[PDB]
Structure 1
Amino acid sequence: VTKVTARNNKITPVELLNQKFGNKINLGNFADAVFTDAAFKNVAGIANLPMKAPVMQVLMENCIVSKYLKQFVPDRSVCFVEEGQKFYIVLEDGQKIEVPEDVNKALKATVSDVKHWAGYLTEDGEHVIDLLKPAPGPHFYVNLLIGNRLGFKRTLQTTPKSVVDRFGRGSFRSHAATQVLATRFDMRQEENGFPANRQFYLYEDGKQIFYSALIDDNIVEATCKHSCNRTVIKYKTACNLEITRTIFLVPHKKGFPLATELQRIEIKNASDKARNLSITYTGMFGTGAVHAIFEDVTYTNVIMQSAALYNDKGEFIGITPDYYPEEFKQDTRFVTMIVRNGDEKSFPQSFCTDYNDFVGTGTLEHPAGGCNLNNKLNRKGPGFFALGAPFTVEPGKTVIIDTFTGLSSSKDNENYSDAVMLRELDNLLRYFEKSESVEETLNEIINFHENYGKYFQFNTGNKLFDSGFNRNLAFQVLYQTFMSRSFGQTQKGYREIGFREIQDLFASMYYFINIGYQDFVKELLFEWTANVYKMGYANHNFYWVGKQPGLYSDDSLWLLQAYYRYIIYTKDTSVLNEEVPVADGNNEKRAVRETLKAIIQYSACISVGDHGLPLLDLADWNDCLKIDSNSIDGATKEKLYYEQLKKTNGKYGDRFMSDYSESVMNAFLLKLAIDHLAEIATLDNDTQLAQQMSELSKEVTDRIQKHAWKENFFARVLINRYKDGSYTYLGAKGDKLSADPNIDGVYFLNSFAWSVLSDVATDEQIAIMVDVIKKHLLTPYGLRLVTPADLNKIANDTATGHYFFGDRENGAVFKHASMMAVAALIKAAKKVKDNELAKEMARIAYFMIDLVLPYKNLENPFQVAGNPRICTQYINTDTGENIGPLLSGTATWLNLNLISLAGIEYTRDGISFNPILREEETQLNFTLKAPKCSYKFSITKPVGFARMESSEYELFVDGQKIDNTVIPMYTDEKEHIVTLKFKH
């Protein structure tokens, strides 16, 4: 027998359709087709579509169209064409047949409004989704909900999180990986939680009439609206019932449970007769023993039981899972339902806690015993629950069912027990007793996200871009600040906060400082500083305590940048005098200034190679550069360094002698950190520290220029363990490590990016690297992270690849690295003397940005996939599809790059205004919010590239023409108008 793989099957159905019907009929710009047999010999398709979409699959789903095609296409290729508001079928020989009336009507109904199959964005950036249409990708219809723990202890650790899809499915997690609602670990990416989560059934006269997760013939229409931190789903039934589901997380208040999710279900009777209905709201509680799911499911089943909750009057209100082991009793989950028939409150009358009894002989969509629950408390088994209550809806009236699903944990209370959970649940119910109290709360949430994003507001003509930046991007930045990369649709494992993820604070801090939360930023900075050891290395990960000390060499170097930004924006040098505990433990504390000095010393003097550049250790920012197999972490290096100092009678601060490889990206980060520390010391009136840092920066720049430049590019890694000269460097021409014969040597994008960002490369070097990038690193789908390389020559311990071409580490475009490169390009374009080079760099930057903006994913949704409101991780270079977890460094650097392109940069003297606009753009207006004032920026230019470095410009501030390009930070609590005019 023979095998034919998916990628080896070169001929696609669309290509075969074009071959067969290319000259006979006009196929238009887009067409769809499908193979009619496993032999891939005949095709069936429809032509002249507005955009690429799986129309053929939907057509085959229809019974009438399938039956009509059955008589035509078991072995004969056919095509569908539209002429004169009628549908014809064209055969391969040339006959055109007018289809009968029913199939013509079905085709007209299906083809209508193809352009909105994936949905559309409103003027506020909200995504409107039809529930009957296919999904472009697993992450396309996903929304992320967040809590609000501001003003409370351990904000990062204890913030609740949730993921909700278009049907309301998903999951809900408390601190760390604690699950309130069950998370499903299955083979598909679409299944994130248990199917019964946040779903309910509506019965009438003992007969099921509605299921929230099923669209039967009884539903005329059903739409979902994804917004910022809330989800709204609307159903309309054929029996004149309007159902509205609103899902959101409750912001934390004093005495509330640690995590709480609220779902409000409004049922309106549009008919003229009273309806006696019943509602059954189902769900499944998450387990406390996550590892036992793989190890022993029976262990998870037998260690817990079900319990009922009764209010002060002895009325049943909800179900909780009760655990026997003492360790699993530190978190207590609950679910509660309240029915409001206007101003009258009622509670569920029946419950079920057994999945088998509930489903019976039917399925989850049509439970056999879903109407009459047995009211039996299960002695074991998973925390499945179903609460049932009857009600009556008068003609034209509405009934509101509020469901609270939550968890109370010991991480927020002392002497924790179930009594604490009961008290907190009582407080929550008492707070939400009134019907309006829920609605107001929702408004509060909206107002928060309508204010947090007011730091930077765009006012361009394109409403989609303005909504995407002002609302969606700011929310994503806040979400990544609060959660880093610990949750998502496909990010279901347990993850701790990485040190490098402090990059998320680079963009979000300016928002927080502008809503009166500067102390929160200070607390985050101190929390990150507490994970730095005395020597200078830092813990790689930390959630409650740090771990992996000094595993990666580039971690601590990031911290400096963050501090710089803060001190630049607020002029608050007092943070330098704060005493923070060191990561070594015991009870020792150190000043922040001394910690920064130690961080600089650990990479500038100690832990350096033969060339004086920082050591690679296990790996730098890039986790694939595992060149050194015998690498050591911070603790082992410190012990060996102390032994060496004792043996050789050396002095502290001398080089740690070894033959490990050197990292040049770490050198660029070190140079940037040294410059930032010099600037901070200058701002702190510490002349000697500033002068020392300036001399150290000059020396490091000289070392980098002498040992890293290789006449064509900046080398990535310097190798010292080969004394015969077989291999000395990696990441430049002539390194003899390229896996592609057509490429002279390996090239790394980060080398150029951080050579420009650290202000090390000169103009000639910048031009040379730009030419090299255009030649090799530029692809039709973006910028590659690195050209193909063969690291087995130097590191034989490296294994083979794990991905097909175009996936992740096999040629994909990682949008985080591409965004850093775009930031470098924007920075270079503002200062290079050559105007043509600046124009080319700006063009490349805008081209790369246009491939990352989420709102542009709706132009060709069924080819690029992704998400129209949330940035994805990488782009598959073989197909162009946006793939990856919804949480990554893409959002932060995209926000920073857009702000920089607007021309806003913060320096010691204030705001260095220097915009770079698109060639076609002729007007750019935006509003900037400052702690003590505000600015309204307007920029006007003719068509074509323009910048103040070369073009002629007039600048006015408050109606007064000025020559300096630095705008001072006013403190008069007024709005200042800034106007820029470019003259041809």
Structure 2
Amino acid sequence: GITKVTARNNKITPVELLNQKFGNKINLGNFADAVFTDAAFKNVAGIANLPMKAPVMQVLMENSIVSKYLKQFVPDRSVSFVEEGQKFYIVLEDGQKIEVPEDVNKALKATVSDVKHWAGYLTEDGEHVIDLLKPAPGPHFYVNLLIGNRLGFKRTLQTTPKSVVDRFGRGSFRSHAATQVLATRFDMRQEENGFPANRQFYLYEDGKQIFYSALIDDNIVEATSKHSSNRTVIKYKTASNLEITRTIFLVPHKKGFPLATELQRIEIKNASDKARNLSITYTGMFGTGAVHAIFEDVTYTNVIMQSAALYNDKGEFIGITPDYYPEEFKQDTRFVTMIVRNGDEKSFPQSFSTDYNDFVGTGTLEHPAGGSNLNNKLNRKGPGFFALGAPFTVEPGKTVIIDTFTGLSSSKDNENYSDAVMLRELDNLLRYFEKSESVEETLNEIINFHENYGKYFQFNTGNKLFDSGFNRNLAFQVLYQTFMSRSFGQTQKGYREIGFREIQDLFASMYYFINIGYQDFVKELLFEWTANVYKMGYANHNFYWVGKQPGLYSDDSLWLLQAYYRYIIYTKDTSVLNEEVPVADGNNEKRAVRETLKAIIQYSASISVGDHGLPLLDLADWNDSLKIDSNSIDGATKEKLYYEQLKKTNGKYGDRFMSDYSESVMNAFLLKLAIDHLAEIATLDNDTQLAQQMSELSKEVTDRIQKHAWKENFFARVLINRYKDGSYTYLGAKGDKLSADPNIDGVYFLNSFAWSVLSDVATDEQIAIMVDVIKKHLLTPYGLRLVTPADLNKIANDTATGHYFFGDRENGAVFKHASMMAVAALIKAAKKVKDNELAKEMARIAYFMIDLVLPYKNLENPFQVAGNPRISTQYINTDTGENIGPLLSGTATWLNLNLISLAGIEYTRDGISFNPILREEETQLNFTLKAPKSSYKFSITKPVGFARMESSEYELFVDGQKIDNTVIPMYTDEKEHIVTLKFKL
């Protein structure tokens, strides 16, 4: 009877049908576009010889002339557009070639003239210029992220405002935690992040709507947007010679200011020869305080709040605020205010509206019926919709400025908070910005701050796109992820706390902060993370104001050692070891940092270990899908049981916790790295005995890993101890009998090899074997996948079936974070392996994987790979090659680390270890580095081909003096030092 055909089961594509029908008749070129003309997929209509893949037929069908002309042929007849000479022809399946009329030819040429830049382009500074009339390659492609600046104030990690702005100005604005200033929309589409009325405005002339900022109509002749670092600029040109500019950014915090403030400046210039009397209506929607009640009870959200008006000391209306009855929703107060600067005179809105139904009327949001006549009625219910209207006359050649301040004041930064505090802070903010030039000065301050922040490491390679992407975009993303973790984004709209392992972000940004005089901020972050470690050694999984989920995951506390090692090595500041930080257990208890690190190592190395001595897997580790044990316990219950066992067995503290739980090998690698880091810290702190115990413990752990985790072709991922019959003993190598692919003998994890190399456990032969294995199995045309297919139901029957189609997330996708860690391991191995061929192959693999994650390269084939040309995405779909969000992940952090490492810079106790690994085709690499008391200018020259310090003669000069030691000293003479490296044939 009725049959069903799915999207993935439809094998034939329109382009394939077009190639079949017209391949031997016309030259299809390298790229072409096509569309099915009917629901039976029998006939196609397309255009040939495109410069790149693009939805050209979708744009063509929107043209009335072209669609009307095509109606003579389609459906029931396949046609193709072909350009010959300077004219366009239509070709049918019978070989007939017909010259199109003049209007059709003109429309076709105008459409296909600029296909190469349909998705935009990047300037020399890495800013993305977007045409507002073009289709979006993906939901994250045209997204910009804005952040505040709470440096030097309390609770910087928890109180920094955040915002997401798209190409049209749409998006949302959030204060501390998940508090909303502008409304966030939770709907079916990924493109709808906020309420559609946010940040939009209307322009009226003579009572007729002449402009809407979120709708490009026939009266707009030019409309472009520019995404830059922490600011967005949108430009419009109208047919009546009006030039409109919108600049959106976030105000850096000053004393007496509200906690969150977003500034939008609208400049309207009259390029005509006649004065024009216009009016502006700026609209928006406040975010509700009862987010759960949106899904629970919308009427509750509506009836608990009302609208209120704000007046200055002269009694003039200035803006609207939402007023809440319940006390819990009175701890934050929102506001929106408008100032109209006409030449030297200042004015304030003359009308307002607070009801969506009255404002829209019988029209739509794009053409509201009551937009030009605001009723000045204060709504007694929610939601907090607002529309402020003001008239103004602009003279020929003159400009009128409109400054809108949206924001929120909170009790999180004030004592005895009330609405009076909000009024005082709003008065301070308005007095600060009473002059026109103050907004420009603040914008310049933001730009200069980010430019100076990015100065720690500067690339100079001639490739402007790469230099801009690293020096500006990547540095900003690292700062943003340091301040925000993974809590906000275009599609990250729920409430999320800061994860412990997200300390990984501080692995990259700290060197930047220390280089702008904010070493104390890095110390504060380190102590804040240390405060979430319990006395035994486990840590809270998440924390925003307080910690939660104690010891839920077994790998969390082991990441802190890497951050402490990085900070102490870079700064040589061991005094942080003596700092007394509160313990996560509580009850006014404090411990020295050194003792906390010792407790972490002891917990992961002696107490929470399995039969083979490797750390217990517990519920899971870094890999969230490794739910091998269904009877796992957290830190608190494990501690209680451990104390019970100690009292029963009459043992001593530090003994093994008896159990039959599984062991994590990646946890063992992390523990070994942490032990080595603590040994280095102790020997830097003149703690000889502690260094000795750390060294012997590291040797013992390495012996255990080599004895019990190496399975003759790979390092295992999990060791299983609960099957006494021997049915299953390990997972993550050959012979584990858990592979779900008949053609693959065993399961293989990328992280196993990555952290075997990173922890300096694997040997050269093991490195070569694992590299061969990952080349055979884990390498895909779109990168390196996290893991080969596995059948975990045999050992854990409680695991459910899959949730994703092939190529998505857990079903064979390429996760860029894990791939970046693997690339770091490959670089580290290639820097020191004896075999030159193995090093060359590993460097080639690393560069191949790096080329797939650089955001700017997303603009080469934007409509196939999607992603974002300035911000890193999460993973790559192995079925289509498309980059899919969210935009916040460890990809940016580990990519920055990998690029710096490939430049050859490493930090050790003796100073700067230099060991660059350049591309085979590269012949020159120049960059500049900053140190707290010096600067370095590195230049490297080499011939075409692979070259490295390990197996190639070279000349190294520091300050013009030839040197043999590759460790550059960390100078403190406040002088610039020139370093030159030359590779010979």
Asked if Structure 1 and Structure 2 have the same fold, meaning a TM-score greater than 0.5 normalized by the shorter chain, the answer is: yes
1:400 aligned residue: 401
Output the CA distance in 2 between the equivalents of 1:63 and 1:290.
44
Give CA deviations for 1:89-119 in whole Å, capped at 9, x if unaligned: 0001100000001111100100010000000
Task: Tell me by how many angstroms 1:257 deviates.
Answer: 0.0
Output the CA distance in 2 between the equivalents of 1:959 and 1:230.
43
1:928 aligned residue: 929
Task: Tell me by how many angstroms 1:558 deviates.
Answer: 0.2
Output the CA distance in 1 between the equivalents of 2:937 and 2:734.
48
Task: Tell me by how many angstroms 1:187 deviates.
Answer: 0.1
Output the CA distance in 2 between the equivalents of 1:436 and 1:727.
72
1:3 aligned residue: 4
Give CA deviations for 1:716-747 in whole Å, capped at 9, x if unaligned: 00000000000000000000000000000000
Output the CA distance in 2 between the equivalents of 1:817 and 1:798.
23
Does the alignment pair 1:324 with 2:311?
A: no
Task: Give the match's secondary structure for 2:897.
Answer: helix
Output the CA distance in 1 between the equivalents of 2:722 and 2:582.
38
Give CA deviations for 1:895-930 in whole Å, capped at 9, x if unaligned: 000000000000000000000000000000000000
Give CA deviations for 1:933-963 in whole Å, capped at 9, x if unaligned: 0000000000000001001100000000000
Give CA deviations for 1:295-334 in whole Å, capped at 9, x if unaligned: 0000000000000000000000000000000000000000
Task: Tell me by how many angstroms 1:264 deviates.
Answer: 0.1
Which stretches of structure 1, 4 residues or longer, exceed 2 Å deviation after superposition? none
1:463 aligned residue: 464
Output the CA distance in 1 between the equivalents of 2:927 and 2:296.
56
2:256 aligned residue: 255
Does the alignment pair 1:431 with 2:404?
A: no
Output the CA distance in 2 between the equivalents of 1:635 and 1:979.
55
Task: Give the match's secondary structure for 1:411.
Answer: helix
Task: Tell me by how many angstroms 1:879 deviates.
Answer: 0.0
Task: Tell me by how many angstroms 1:760 deviates.
Answer: 0.1
Matches for 1:153-552 after TM superposition, within 5 Å: 153-552=154-553
Task: Tell me by how many angstroms 1:84 deviates.
Answer: 1.1
Task: Tell me by how many angstroms 1:514 deviates.
Answer: 0.2
Q: Any gaps of 5 or more consecutive residues in structure 2? A: none
Output the CA distance in 2 between the equivalents of 1:456 and 1:140.
27
Output the CA distance in 2 between the equivalents of 1:863 and 1:84.
29
Output the CA distance in 2 between the equivalents of 1:429 and 1:208.
30
Give CA deviations for 1:113-137 in whole Å, capped at 9, x if unaligned: 0000000000000000000000000
Give CA deviations for 1:242-297 in whole Å, capped at 9, x if unaligned: 00000000000000000000000000000011000000000000000000000000
Output the CA distance in 1 between the equivalents of 2:419 and 2:774.
61
Task: Tell me by how many angstroms 1:876 deviates.
Answer: 0.1
Task: Tell me by how many angstroms 1:749 deviates.
Answer: 0.2
Output the CA distance in 2 between the equivalents of 1:76 and 1:356.
48
Task: Give the match's secondary structure for 1:333.
Answer: strand
Output the CA distance in 2 between the equivalents of 1:188 and 1:73.
32
Output the CA distance in 2 between the equivalents of 1:879 and 1:342.
54
Output the CA distance in 2 between the equivalents of 1:318 and 1:799.
53
Output the CA distance in 2 between the equivalents of 1:553 and 1:460.
42
Output the CA distance in 2 between the equivalents of 1:366 and 1:616.
59
Output the CA distance in 2 between the equivalents of 1:44 and 1:438.
52
Give CA deviations for 1:181-224 in whole Å, capped at 9, x if unaligned: 00000000000000000000000000000000000001001000
Output the CA distance in 1 between the equivalents of 2:613 and 2:344.
75
2:944 aligned residue: 943
Give CA deviations for 1:511-557 in whole Å, capped at 9, x if unaligned: 00000000000000000000000000000000000000000000000
2:810 aligned residue: 809
Output the CA distance in 1 between the equivalents of 2:109 and 2:955.
57
Task: Give the match's secondary structure for 1:318.
Answer: strand
Output the CA distance in 1 between the equivalents of 2:758 and 2:436.
55
Task: Tell me by how many angstroms 1:777 deviates.
Answer: 0.2
Give CA deviations for 1:741-774 in whole Å, capped at 9, x if unaligned: 0000000000000000000000000000000000
2:900 aligned residue: 899
Task: Give the match's secondary structure for 2:905.
Answer: coil
Output the CA distance in 2 between the equivalents of 1:254 and 1:811.
50
Output the CA distance in 2 between the equivalents of 1:284 and 1:603.
50
Give CA deviations for 1:478-500 in whole Å, capped at 9, x if unaligned: 00000000000000000000000
Task: Give the match's secondary structure for 1:534.
Answer: coil
Task: Give the match's secondary structure for 2:301.
Answer: helix
Give CA deviations for 1:366-421 in whole Å, capped at 9, x if unaligned: 00000010000000020000000000000100000000000000000000000000
Output the CA distance in 2 between the equivalents of 1:854 and 1:45.
30
Task: Tell me by how many angstroms 1:842 deviates.
Answer: 0.1
Output the CA distance in 1 between the equivalents of 2:494 and 2:344.
44
1:715 aligned residue: 716
Give CA deviations for 1:554-596 in whole Å, capped at 9, x if unaligned: 0000000000000000000000000000000100000000000
Task: Give the match's secondary structure for 2:413.
Answer: coil
Output the CA distance in 2 between the equivalents of 1:381 and 1:582.
44
Output the CA distance in 1 between the equivalents of 2:74 and 2:28.
19
Output the CA distance in 1 between the equivalents of 2:183 and 2:370.
22
Task: Give the match's secondary structure for 1:785.
Answer: coil
Task: Give the match's secondary structure for 1:599.
Answer: helix
Task: Tell me by how many angstroms 1:168 deviates.
Answer: 0.1
Task: Tell me by how many angstroms 1:73 deviates.
Answer: 1.3
Give CA deviations for 1:664-696 in whole Å, capped at 9, x if unaligned: 000000000000000000000000000000000
Matches for 1:901-920 after TM superposition, within 5 Å: 901-920=902-921
Task: Tell me by how many angstroms 1:343 deviates.
Answer: 1.4
Output the CA distance in 1 between the equivalents of 2:237 and 2:450.
30
Task: Give the match's secondary structure for 1:181.
Answer: coil
Output the CA distance in 2 between the equivalents of 1:386 and 1:491.
28
Q: TM-score under structure 1 normalisation?
A: 1.00
Output the CA distance in 2 between the equivalents of 1:360 and 1:164.
28
Output the CA distance in 2 between the equivalents of 1:448 and 1:758.
37
Task: Tell me by how many angstroms 1:799 deviates.
Answer: 0.2
Does the alignment pair 1:866 with 2:867?
A: yes
Output the CA distance in 1 between the equivalents of 2:413 and 2:955.
57
Give CA deviations for 1:441-479 in whole Å, capped at 9, x if unaligned: 000000001000000000001000000000000000000
Output the CA distance in 2 between the equivalents of 1:246 and 1:60.
34
Task: Give the match's secondary structure for 2:130.
Answer: strand
Q: TM-score under structure 2 normalisation?
A: 1.00
Output the CA distance in 2 between the equivalents of 1:610 and 1:395.
84
Output the CA distance in 2 between the equivalents of 1:704 and 1:184.
50
Output the CA distance in 2 between the equivalents of 1:718 and 1:966.
40
Task: Give the match's secondary structure for 1:905.
Answer: strand
Task: Tell me by how many angstroms 1:68 deviates.
Answer: 0.5
Task: Tell me by how many angstroms 1:798 deviates.
Answer: 0.2
Output the CA distance in 2 between the equivalents of 1:838 and 1:445.
43
Task: Give the match's secondary structure for 2:703.
Answer: helix
Task: Tell me by how many angstroms 1:74 deviates.
Answer: 1.2
Output the CA distance in 2 between the equivalents of 1:658 and 1:329.
51
Output the CA distance in 2 between the equivalents of 1:190 and 1:146.
20
Task: Tell me by how many angstroms 1:793 deviates.
Answer: 0.1
Output the CA distance in 2 between the equivalents of 1:623 and 1:602.
21
Output the CA distance in 1 between the equivalents of 2:671 and 2:789.
27
Give CA deviations for 1:22-61 in whole Å, capped at 9, x if unaligned: 1111000000000000000100000000000000000011
Task: Tell me by how many angstroms 1:225 deviates.
Answer: 0.2
Task: Tell me by how many angstroms 1:342 deviates.
Answer: 1.3
Output the CA distance in 2 between the equivalents of 1:431 and 1:608.
59
Give the total of aligned pairs. Answer: 984
Output the CA distance in 2 between the equivalents of 1:937 and 1:11.
53
Output the CA distance in 1 between the equivalents of 2:442 and 2:550.
43
Output the CA distance in 2 between the equivalents of 1:327 and 1:296.
17
Output the CA distance in 2 between the equivalents of 1:74 and 1:517.
66
